[PDB]
Amino acid sequence: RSSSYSGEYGSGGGKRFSHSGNQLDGPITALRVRVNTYYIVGLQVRYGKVWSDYVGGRNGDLEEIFLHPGESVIQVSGKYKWYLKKLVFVTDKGRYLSFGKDSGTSFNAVPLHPNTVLRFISGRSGSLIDAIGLHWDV
Ligand SMILES: CO[C@H]1O[C@H](CO)[C@@H](O)[C@H](O)[C@@H]1O
Ligand SMILES: [Cl-]
Ligand SMILES: [Cl-]
């Protein structure tokens, strides 16, 4: 196996979600994060040309970053309490795509195996993002 899973970061509230099928549409090309005063409310990830189903709640402001062609995520750090509060996507182009608020329990996620990148994300959500899981592969 060249695949790995960083997680789960957050708590066990709400229902679960997986973007496992979405990796068939392509690599991660853009990111959507909805953040409010304290939490990360919602997530949406663009695989190839296709956006995923929105997960989370409505109580926040939409933030959106497109990735450069051939750019992939190689590290993910963040913060959480019972709910996810911060997310930072580090890309191989050396960019730091920070979303959310600077407070809580920190985590730092890197792939296990050689030359692997973030392929899809999992986690739990309700009206906020309870938990996130990071999936790595070639
Ligand atoms: C209002 O509560 C809802 O949203 C929170 C945050 O996502 C979840 O923990 C919970 O299970 C419910 O789905
Ligand atoms: Cl930057
Ligand atoms: Cl950390």
XYZ file of C-alpha atoms and ligand atoms in Angstrom:
153
model
C 0.000 0.000 0.000
C 1.179 3.492 -0.960
C -1.958 5.046 0.554
C -2.400 6.462 4.060
C -4.948 8.217 6.278
C -4.315 11.172 8.574
C -7.064 11.389 11.188
C -9.478 11.543 12.604
C -9.108 15.131 13.832
C -12.077 16.585 15.721
C -14.870 14.943 17.716
C -17.586 12.331 17.088
C -20.627 14.546 16.506
C -22.900 14.745 13.462
C -22.926 12.364 10.498
C -19.932 11.058 8.524
C -18.853 11.917 4.975
C -16.309 10.581 2.488
C -15.039 12.011 -0.796
C -13.720 8.546 -1.718
C -15.718 8.347 -4.952
C -14.835 11.910 -5.970
C -11.186 11.023 -6.688
C -12.438 9.344 -9.895
C -13.334 12.840 -11.185
C -9.688 13.931 -10.883
C -7.134 15.471 -8.499
C -7.971 18.306 -6.080
C -8.096 21.533 -8.125
C -9.879 23.987 -5.779
C -11.037 24.385 -2.166
C -14.150 25.876 -0.564
C -14.252 26.581 3.156
C -17.055 28.381 4.976
C -15.853 30.003 8.219
C -17.542 32.052 10.956
C -16.298 33.803 14.121
C -15.008 30.648 15.843
C -15.573 27.541 13.703
C -15.228 25.971 10.280
C -18.823 25.666 9.137
C -18.601 23.990 5.740
C -16.314 22.322 3.220
C -16.408 21.642 -0.505
C -13.555 20.227 -2.597
C -13.163 20.402 -6.391
C -11.928 17.137 -7.902
C -10.903 17.776 -11.492
C -13.659 19.901 -13.023
C -16.283 18.624 -10.560
C -17.244 20.169 -7.205
C -18.241 17.820 -4.387
C -21.546 17.881 -2.505
C -21.472 20.636 0.115
C -21.063 19.379 3.680
C -21.677 21.392 6.855
C -23.897 24.380 7.644
C -24.941 27.781 6.316
C -23.865 29.991 9.228
C -20.644 31.396 7.729
C -18.763 33.296 5.024
C -17.555 31.408 1.939
C -13.821 31.343 1.240
C -12.499 29.838 -1.989
C -9.021 29.148 -3.387
C -8.261 27.593 -6.778
C -5.041 25.604 -7.190
C -2.511 26.133 -9.990
C -2.319 23.458 -12.716
C -0.237 20.518 -11.453
C -0.314 21.821 -7.870
C -1.041 19.296 -5.105
C -1.437 19.393 -1.301
C 1.467 17.853 0.648
C 0.726 18.840 4.277
C -2.389 19.729 6.254
C -2.375 21.428 9.661
C -5.271 22.800 11.703
C -7.012 23.410 15.027
C -10.119 22.004 16.737
C -12.165 21.798 19.947
C -15.271 19.603 19.693
C -15.517 21.136 16.213
C -12.933 21.999 13.549
C -11.707 25.598 13.861
C -8.731 25.981 11.464
C -7.306 24.434 8.265
C -4.018 25.073 6.458
C -3.295 23.399 3.122
C 0.379 23.365 2.153
C 0.959 22.828 -1.565
C 4.078 21.698 -3.447
C 4.188 25.142 -5.128
C 5.052 26.268 -1.579
C 1.721 28.000 -0.912
C 0.017 28.102 2.489
C -3.762 28.147 2.096
C -5.017 29.072 5.563
C -8.692 29.022 6.558
C -10.345 29.599 9.944
C -9.383 30.851 13.409
C -6.128 30.440 15.355
C -7.184 28.589 18.548
C -7.545 25.083 20.025
C -5.902 21.669 19.659
C -3.380 21.621 16.808
C -2.628 18.755 14.427
C -0.061 18.336 11.654
C -0.679 15.791 8.927
C 1.869 14.415 6.471
C 1.653 11.407 4.112
C 3.305 8.146 5.195
C 4.778 6.967 1.916
C 7.119 8.388 -0.762
C 5.792 10.914 -3.288
C 2.129 10.758 -2.211
C -0.295 13.699 -2.051
C -3.757 14.560 -0.703
C -6.256 12.668 -2.859
C -9.509 13.172 -0.944
C -10.883 14.192 2.462
C -13.284 12.522 4.888
C -14.760 13.499 8.260
C -17.964 14.285 10.133
C -20.322 17.241 9.747
C -23.668 18.711 10.797
C -24.258 22.450 11.059
C -20.464 22.730 11.454
C -17.440 20.583 10.588
C -17.110 18.233 13.554
C -14.127 16.276 12.255
C -11.807 15.967 9.251
C -9.802 13.052 7.861
C -7.055 13.359 5.267
C -6.464 10.670 2.635
C -3.105 10.388 0.871
C -2.023 8.493 -2.250
C -0.172 8.727 -5.574
C -26.798 21.713 15.978
O -26.042 20.505 16.064
C -25.848 19.903 14.778
O -24.586 20.317 14.230
C -23.482 20.008 15.100
C -22.193 20.583 14.513
O -21.975 20.042 13.204
C -23.378 18.486 15.293
O -22.355 18.195 16.251
C -24.705 17.901 15.778
O -24.641 16.472 15.743
C -25.869 18.384 14.916
O -25.782 17.789 13.615
Cl 1.096 31.798 0.559
Cl 0.682 20.446 15.600
